[PDB]
Amino acid sequence: NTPLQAIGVPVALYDALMARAIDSADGTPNSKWLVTASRDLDDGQAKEVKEGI
């Protein structure tokens, strides 16, 4: 008769949830400003757009 008999369900929920936390911490891009060009932009000046921004 110990408290450990009735906490298996919650402790599993915690370790599963914190595993979700640590997993999504590294793996989700931390970048902003998804810039995309149009088709006709002449790489060679499209890079000029990149260095400018």
Binding site: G44, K47, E48, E51
Partner: protein, 97 residues
């Protein structure tokens, strides 16, 4: 001597079936040479020797060169607190150093 009248005619199909005469064609050429090179900005530019007052931009000094030199010849910088001249081999394709 840059754009022959016969070349203009053979491009624009005015060949053996004539539109407005060579007088209007040469006027059109003289007025198309003021729309081009004015929309783009370039000049006659033979082998050039561009000297230009370059303006400090930022604490680290972006230097945009107004003519993007060829690929690797050292552009020289002098004056404006520069007691001694100095060369810099620039970017090919771009002109920001």
């Amino acid at each position: 001597t840059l754009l022959p009248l016969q070349t203009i005619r053979e491009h624009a199909k005015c060949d053996d079936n004539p539109r407005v005469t060579d007088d209007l064609l040469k006027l059109y050429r003289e007025a198309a040479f003021e729309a081009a090179e004015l929309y783009t900005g370039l000049s006659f530019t033979p082998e050039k020797t561009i000297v230009e007052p370059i303006r400090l931009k930022g604490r680290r000094g972006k230097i945009i060169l107004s003519a993007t030199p060829i690929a690797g010849r050292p552009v020289v910088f002098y004056g404006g607190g520069l007691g001694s001249p100095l060369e810099l081999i620039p970017r090919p394709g771009s002109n920001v150093l």
